Design a protein around this ligand. Structure first.
Ligand SMILES: CCCCCCCCCCCCCC(=O)O
Ligand SMILES: CCCCCCCCCCCCCC(=O)O
Lengths: 157, 157
């Protein structure tokens, strides 16, 4: 269940800028089933702070409407692991990224969701291979992927 | 998009009896998202009629409740292809089965959903491999799998 793959030698400054949530998977179906499931979040932009923390802009459907949400991930001892304040303190692990095209990540509390991010609104078969193979290891029960048209809309409608 | 894998030399009498919908995937996320999505159907039992048609018992969530539904699939020229009466006349294709453990199928109208069925409430990694690899070919955007506990409940709650 635990995630035991992280990016060796991650430079968090190089993941700054725009991303698309091409695909997402989670351990429990109810975390992603509906448009307003808890972890159905669409990534807009990564903004690393100078002090090394990560700021995230994303979209989340709630109250029948697509909201913008800004969120702050705090660094830890490990460069590929970050921390998000909540009801219960969640972890974000960076699995892999080539900076220029794709980045794979997971978040944990036991529950768990992961995502394949890409720089452009295109179906990258390669990044998807890598995403599937990192997931093989994990106990997933729901997976979503989206098309180029959907990737350009708010909340992937 | 089209399904171009079918079981060679299918004997429809040998798939009679009990099955579990271990996993399901579809081309559009809305066909499977909610408990009452159109193609979120859980297979209970296969009953082949003497004249070669297939009778299916299944469970479908609707009106906030888990209903039993009986359904009838009519044979065609091809042993692995069957036909279900509806608003629009749908096809059911049998991709693969070893009769004793697993059976993979898809249904078509363009929309498309497939399933990995198994005889017992157990996670069969093998049948899942075969399911993933038959799906590789197809344009899927939502996938669900269920655990042994869920497999014994009505509507996989
Ligand atoms: C390094 C890139 C990681 C991107 C992580 C995105 C953060 C997702 C947190 C999801 C928690 C729900 C958001 C909320 O509504 O508060
Ligand atoms: C050979 C085994 C094939 C099993 C096929 C199951 C039939 C699924 C039909 C789904 C259509 C919706 C059912 C309904 O509510 O009318």
């Amino acid at each position: 269940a635990s995630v035991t793959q992280t990016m060796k030698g991650l430079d968090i400054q190089k993941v700054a800028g725009t991303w698309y949530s091409l695909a997402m998977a989670a351990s429990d179906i109810s975390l992603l089933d509906a448009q307003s499931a808890p972890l159905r979040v669409y990534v807009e932009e990564l903004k690393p702070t100078p002090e090394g923390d990560l700021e995230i802009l994303l979209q989340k459907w709630e109250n029948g409407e697509c909201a913008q949400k800004k969120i702050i991930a705090e660094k830890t001892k490990i460069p590929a692991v970050f921390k998000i304040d909540a009801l219960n303190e969640n972890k974000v692990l960076v699995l892999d990224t080539d900076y220029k095209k794709y980045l794979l990540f997971c978040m944990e509390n036991q529950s768990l969701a992961c995502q394949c991010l890409v720089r452009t609104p295109e179906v990258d078969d390669e990044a998807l291979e890598k995403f599937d193979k990192a997931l093989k290891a994990l106990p997933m029960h729901i997976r979503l992927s989206f098309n180029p048209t959907q990737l350009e809309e708010q909340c992937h409608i």
